[PDB]
Amino acid sequence: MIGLVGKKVGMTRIFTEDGVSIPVTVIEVEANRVTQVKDLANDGYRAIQVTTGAKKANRVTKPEAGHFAKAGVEAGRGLWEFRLAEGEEFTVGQSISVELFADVKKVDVTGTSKGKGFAGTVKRWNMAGQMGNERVTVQSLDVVRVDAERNLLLVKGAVPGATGSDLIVKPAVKA
Template sequence: MIGLVGKKLGITRIFTKDSLSIPVTLIEVLDNFVVQIKSLKTDNYESIQVTTGIKKKNNILKPEKGHFLKYKASVGRGLWEFRCKKVLRFKCGQRITINSFSNVKRVDVTGVSKGKGFSGTVKRWNFRMQDATHGNSLSHRVPGSIGQNQTPGHVFKGKKMSGHLGNTCITIQNLSIIKIDDIKKIMLIKGSIPGYVGSDIVLKPSVKEK
């Protein structure tokens, strides 16, 4: 098992037999197709390149179209790679369905988080605010001192400051699979996952599963 690519549909809740409410995220997992097989002889590493979905003809680039034609595959909405061993067990055009996760209980979910734009340190890093009164003027949400003395005389790399928040690739590990619907091709995962509704999600068997 290498992984699957799906699309986030939204979040809802389901009830157990004990009347417990569980928040779940719905992920649509259409059939994935193997496009390219990379081996040690050709690419110096082993991986499987897959695609899923359909892309509009107007949005297909010529290099992208040529890549799919080379391996005789239909053009999907993107390309994803999964590192794995024993790539010879796969074939170009092979279909990977949601049923391949039928024996998997926990997954690692990767997605691109929602972009929040330029944010200050209070929102971005959870800094505490300064006094609202007691003589404080125009310094309620400022981060405070960021520098050093004359030695070393510069701000260290990685200093928590204002900047772009979100829109980064995030992986949440060890999430439970609540249910898999083979007919509707929907997977229910416990809790929330990164990304907005309609964004692409990468699912892999959890590396921490016991």
């Protein structure tokens, strides 16, 4: 349906009642507010633009400030797009919480791999080329716990990238 954008902070382990250790990743998911709505009539397809975080007004470029003021929302750190599933349509300025993933139990995480120096053929394939600064998508991941008041989301296993990176969580298409 629609995915949110969060920030990686760290990763640790979680202990269950039965006494089982499961790796988890600390992801802070700020409430993403819709800024622009693209429709078939005008834009040619259905989509919603989501912004997260905040930036100092000094560094915000005037075109970006005007675009944000058009939607009447605070300027964030970036913009992301998600393709709708022909479901309910949102409105500009509609804040989106993390409750959507509270009843899915299956999500996919997309991130950016950490940069690395040139790697040999054996290191990469076991062809030389640039390592890092590339996409990484991991699917079939189940959310462990969801905290609405804390905006903290936990997923089994590790996630791509290092601390401070920006990741995207989407509903698990595979089923």
